[PDB]
Amino acid sequence: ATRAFSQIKDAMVFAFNLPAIVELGTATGFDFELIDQAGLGHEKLTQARNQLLAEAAKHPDMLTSVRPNGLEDTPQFKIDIDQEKAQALGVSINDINTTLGAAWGGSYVNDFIDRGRVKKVYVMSEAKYRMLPDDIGDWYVRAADGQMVPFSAFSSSRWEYGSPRLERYNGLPSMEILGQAAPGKSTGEAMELMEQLASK
Amino acid sequence: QEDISDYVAANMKDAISRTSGVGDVQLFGSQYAMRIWMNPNELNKFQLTP
Amino acid sequence: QEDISDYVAANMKDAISRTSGVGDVQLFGSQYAMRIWMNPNELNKFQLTPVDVITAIKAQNAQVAAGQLGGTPPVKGQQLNASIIAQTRLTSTEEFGKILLKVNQDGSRVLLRDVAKIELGGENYDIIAEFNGQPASGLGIKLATGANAL
Amino acid sequence: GKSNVTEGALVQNGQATALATVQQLDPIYVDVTQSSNDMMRLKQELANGTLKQENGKAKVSLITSDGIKFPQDGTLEFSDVTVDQTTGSITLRAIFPNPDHTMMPGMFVRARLEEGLNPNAILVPQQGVTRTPRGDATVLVVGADDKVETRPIVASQAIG
Amino acid sequence: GKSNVTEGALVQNGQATALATVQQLDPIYVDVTQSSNDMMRLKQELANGTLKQENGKAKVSLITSDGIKFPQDGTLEFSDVTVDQTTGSITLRAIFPNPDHTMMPGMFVRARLEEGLNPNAILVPQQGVTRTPRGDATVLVVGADDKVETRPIVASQAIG
Amino acid sequence: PAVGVVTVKTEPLQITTELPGRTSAYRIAEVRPQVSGIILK
Amino acid sequence: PAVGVVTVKTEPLQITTELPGRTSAYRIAEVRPQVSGIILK
Numbered sequence: 001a002t003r004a005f006s007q008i009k010d011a012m013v014f015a016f017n018l019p020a021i022v023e024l025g026t027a028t029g030f031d032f033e034l035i036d037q038a039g040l041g042h043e044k045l046t047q048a049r050n051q052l053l054a055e056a057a058k059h060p061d062m063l064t065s066v067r068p069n070g071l072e073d074t075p076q077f078k079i080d081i082d083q084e085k086a087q088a089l090g091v092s093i094n095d096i097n098t099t100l101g102a103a104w105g106g107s108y109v110n111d112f113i114d115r116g117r118v119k120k121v122y123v124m125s126e127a128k129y130r131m132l133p134d135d136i137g138d139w140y141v142r143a144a145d146g147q148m149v150p151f152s153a154f155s156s157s158r159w160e161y162g163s164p165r166l167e168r169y170n171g172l173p174s175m176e177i178l179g180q181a182a183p184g185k186s187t188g189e190a191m192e193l194m195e196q197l198a199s200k
Numbered sequence: 201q202e203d204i205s206d207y208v209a210a211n212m213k214d215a216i217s218r219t220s221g222v223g224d225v226q227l228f229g230s231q232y233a234m235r236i237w238m239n240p241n242e243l244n245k246f247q248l249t250p
Numbered sequence: 251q252e253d254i255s256d257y258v259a260a261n262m263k264d265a266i267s268r269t270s271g272v273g274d275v276q277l278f279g280s281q282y283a284m285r286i287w288m289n290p291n292e293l294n295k296f297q298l299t300p301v302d303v304i305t306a307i308k309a310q311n312a313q314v315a316a317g318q319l320g321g322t323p324p325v326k327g328q329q330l331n332a333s334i335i336a337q338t339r340l341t342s343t344e345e346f347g348k349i350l351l352k353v354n355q356d357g358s359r360v361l362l363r364d365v366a367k368i369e370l371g372g373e374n375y376d377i378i379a380e381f382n383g384q385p386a387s388g389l390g391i392k393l394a395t396g397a398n399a400l
Numbered sequence: 401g402k403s404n405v406t407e408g409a410l411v412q413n414g415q416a417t418a419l420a421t422v423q424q425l426d427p428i429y430v431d432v433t434q435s436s437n438d439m440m441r442l443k444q445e446l447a448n449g450t451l452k453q454e455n456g457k458a459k460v461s462l463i464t465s466d467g468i469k470f471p472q473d474g475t476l477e478f479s480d481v482t483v484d485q486t487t488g489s490i491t492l493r494a495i496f497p498n499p500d501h502t503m504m505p506g507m508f509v510r511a512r513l514e515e516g517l518n519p520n521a522i523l524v525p526q527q528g529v530t531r532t533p534r535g536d537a538t539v540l541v542v543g544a545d546d547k548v549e550t551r552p553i554v555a556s557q558a559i560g
Numbered sequence: 561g562k563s564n565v566t567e568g569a570l571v572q573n574g575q576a577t578a579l580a581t582v583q584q585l586d587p588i589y590v591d592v593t594q595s596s597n598d599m600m601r602l603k604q605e606l607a608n609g610t611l612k613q614e615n616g617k618a619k620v621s622l623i624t625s626d627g628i629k630f631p632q633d634g635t636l637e638f639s640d641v642t643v644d645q646t647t648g649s650i651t652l653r654a655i656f657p658n659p660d661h662t663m664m665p666g667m668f669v670r671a672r673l674e675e676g677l678n679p680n681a682i683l684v685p686q687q688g689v690t691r692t693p694r695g696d697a698t699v700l701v702v703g704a705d706d707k708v709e710t711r712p713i714v715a716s717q718a719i720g
Numbered sequence: 721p722a723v724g725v726v727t728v729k730t731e732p733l734q735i736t737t738e739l740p741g742r743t744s745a746y747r748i749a750e751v752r753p754q755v756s757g758i759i760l761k
Numbered sequence: 762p763a764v765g766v767v768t769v770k771t772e773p774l775q776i777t778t779e780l781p782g783r784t785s786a787y788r789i790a791e792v793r794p795q796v797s798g799i800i801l802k
């Protein structure tokens with residue numbers, strides 16, 4: 001499978017198999033966190049892990065893989081709801097966020113009864129209107145009196161990173177560093193090597 | 201899919217989850233929840249918000 | 251005191267409550283909390299009450315599930331997926347300072363730091379724990395069943 | 401239209417309420433509400449530039465609630481410079497022919513407002529551009545070496 | 561601008577509404593607006609400072625809502641004494657030159673005014689200032705004998 | 721690596737800003753009575 | 762022991778207040794009619 005999956009571009013296609021308990025991999029595969037204590041946020045925790053993806057690869061002799069089970073820092077699309085600008089435009093803030101957070105992601109509303117059964121009711125935008133950064137400015141939002149205000153009047157909207165799957169352990173942010181024990185060898189020194197590559 | 205996922209949900213899941221021996225039934229779709237699709241060039245027509 | 255009691259509860263408690271044998275960490279007294287000390291001779295200056303001080307903090311300091319560009323379901327012909335950050339929970343004393351209260355044609359837009367002395371501090375001040383007359387937090391550990399106190 | 405007065409209500413010398421609204425429909429204005437910084441940023445791109453115009457000012461089409469355009473189209477007559485206070489938004493005024501009375505004053509009909517033909521549009525598809533670092537777009541162009549280079553760009557208007 | 565009246569509509573002698581609004585755009589005011597305690601404090605910063613010169617008629621620049629600043633600064637015309645009861649206005653007025661009509665009277669633009677400054681006491685780079693404990697930043701300072709001994713400071717206004 | 725790559729052909733781009741017009745009559749001209757009195761017929 | 766000290770002196774810091782406010786024209790002269798009648802043309 002995986003050899004022909006090298007031909008498939010645009011996707012790191014691979015495959016694997018299910019053990020009885022499916023969290024190990026290639027018969028010895030260890031697993032490991034790297035927790036943050038000092039309130040450094042996540043990117044400095046990520047810079048620690050970007051340094052220990054490399055340092056995992058600087059010892060292929062004992063740390064035979066750095067398999068990722070998280071996700072790389074995807075772009076995620078900021079909106080500066082320009083607060084100052086928004087209320088002085090007329091439109092209250094509590095109407096903006098119950099638009100922007102209930103047109104795009106789609107709020108629950110209540111139940112309804114289909115065929116004698118309770119089913120949810122999700123207000124959301126149509127798909128072609130919540131679809132681009134250009135479709136910010138199509139959301140017309142009421143001012144204080146009843147004149148409509150576009151979002152592009154007051155939503156300066158840049159990009160930024162964000163890890164779209166943040167793991168936590170011991171109540172603190174942390175990322176799932178994997179690894180197989182060296183091929184055929186023991187994980188006792190590979191788990192020991194991580195605790196002395198924990199000085200880097 | 202969703203035309204099917206309720207038919208699992210409204211008929212099968214409440215019949216398999218009390219079929220004998222069966223513990224937790226985890227449905228993999230959804231119930232057939234009313235999806236209000238708003239339309240912001242109709243909201244600006246009628247001067248509404250969500 | 252409260253500077254300690256947050257440092258303990260942000261760093262120590264979640265590392266002590268999973269040291270083995272510990273099945274309970276009680277913390278003293280509480281964490282920080284953005285204490286909004288209102289100033290009623292500034293609230294009357296702006297014709298506000300503590301209703302509208304609370305109402306803006308439940309508005310402008312509210313984390314909003316914005317959603318995704320390219321969300322589910324897409325349009326046929328889609329190549330872009332993001333996840334929109336709306337107003338986050340506001341993360342600092344200064345970012346509550348510029349919590350807005352009204353339209354401002356006084357505009358240095360009406361600051362919550364013009365009516366309310368923003369600072370951090372504990373969640374209750376009923377406990378002052380002065381260890382040898384010197385301010386202290388604390389934590390009372392309770393050992394789990396499996397009571398291995400050594 | 402109606403008769404807001406009826407056959408006998410006392411009216412005064414220039415009262416407040418109208419008697420009946422006559423109405424001329426054969427051309428029709430469409431008051432078109434551009435946002436402020438967008439009408440800013442389009443004139444901004446007319447001095448970057450280029451951007452272009454069509455040499456005859458201007459052309460606006462309609463797309464009402466069907467999803468097919470109007471049987472004809474017409475002229476952006478002018479562009480206001482008064483930003484409205486409580487919309488933050490320029491009101492363009494698009495004048496349209498209507499020999500059919502299939503326009504109705506107030507719809508509020510979407511105006512596709514065409515502007516001038518961005519003449520050198522480096523249209524990278526969206527599948528390749530990712531943001532490295534925070535808020536900085538990087539296409540990953542491979543050179544003539546068959547070696548990739550991560551040249552940063554500035555990612556403008558996502559068109560489609 | 562528009563024609564709020566049209567042909568046929570009766571107008572009255574000094575009527576309430578307006579026919580059309582002629583506007584002149586090349587000198588454009590920006591109603592720069594100030595809090596009440598500030599332009600007390602900045603006028604009590606005349607005894608402590610200020611200092612404004614020469615031509616104590618200050619420069620005002622924008623950060624208009626596309627993020628890029630307006631290309632040229634402008635003259636702060638006056639200072640009102642017209643404190644709005646519900647807000648606290650010391651409403652200023654910055655007249656700006658507007659060459660290409662990139663101002664559009666009626667939007668919001670963030671207007672920063674450049675008050676004069678002779679008392680120029682301290683600056684310090686950001687690394688030497690430990691932010692925490694918040695409220696009381698601590699700069700690590702040498703004593704007299706190379707034995708360092710920190711002081712708390714007042715780290716208020718992070719200039720760059 | 722087999723990497724599909726797109727070479728940028730650039731020039732033509734019709735940009736149309738679709739945006740909500742609010743249509744109005746060409747002469748509204750509300751007939752207001754110039755002269756007081758009962759509306760007789 | 763080795764520290765890159767920056768020694769504090771008085772440094773001119775003309776940077777002052779940033780704030781908002783709506784722009785308005787110079788000249789926002791309306792046209793009101795001082796003559797009653799039909800807008801004939």
Ligand SMILES: COCCN1CCN(c2nc(SCCc3ccc(OC)c(OC)c3)c(C#N)c3c2COC(C)(C)C3)CC1
Pocket residue numbers: 018201205226227228229230
């Ligand atoms: C509730 O969802 C979380 C459950 N997770 C663990 C089980 N895993 C698994 N799910 C499935 S079926 C997925 C059905 C489904 C249908 C509609 C959906 O749209 C809503 C949908 O999305 C959730 C999923 C299967 C199989 N065969 C297996 C696993 C796991 O491995 C197997 C070999 C057992 C085969 C799915 C993910």
Ligand SMILES: COCCN1CCN(c2nc(SCCc3ccc(OC)c(OC)c3)c(C#N)c3c2COC(C)(C)C3)CC1
Pocket residue numbers: 278279280377378379386387388389390
């Ligand atoms: C709100 O408190 C309820 C808990 N009670 C039972 C445990 N008790 C006890 N607390 C402590 S240390 C308390 C740490 C602390 C720190 C900051 C505080 O200010 C916020 C604070 O006030 C509560 C306490 C000790 C000891 N040593 C003992 C008892 C009790 O007796 C011992 C011999 C175990 C010594 C404290 C009172």
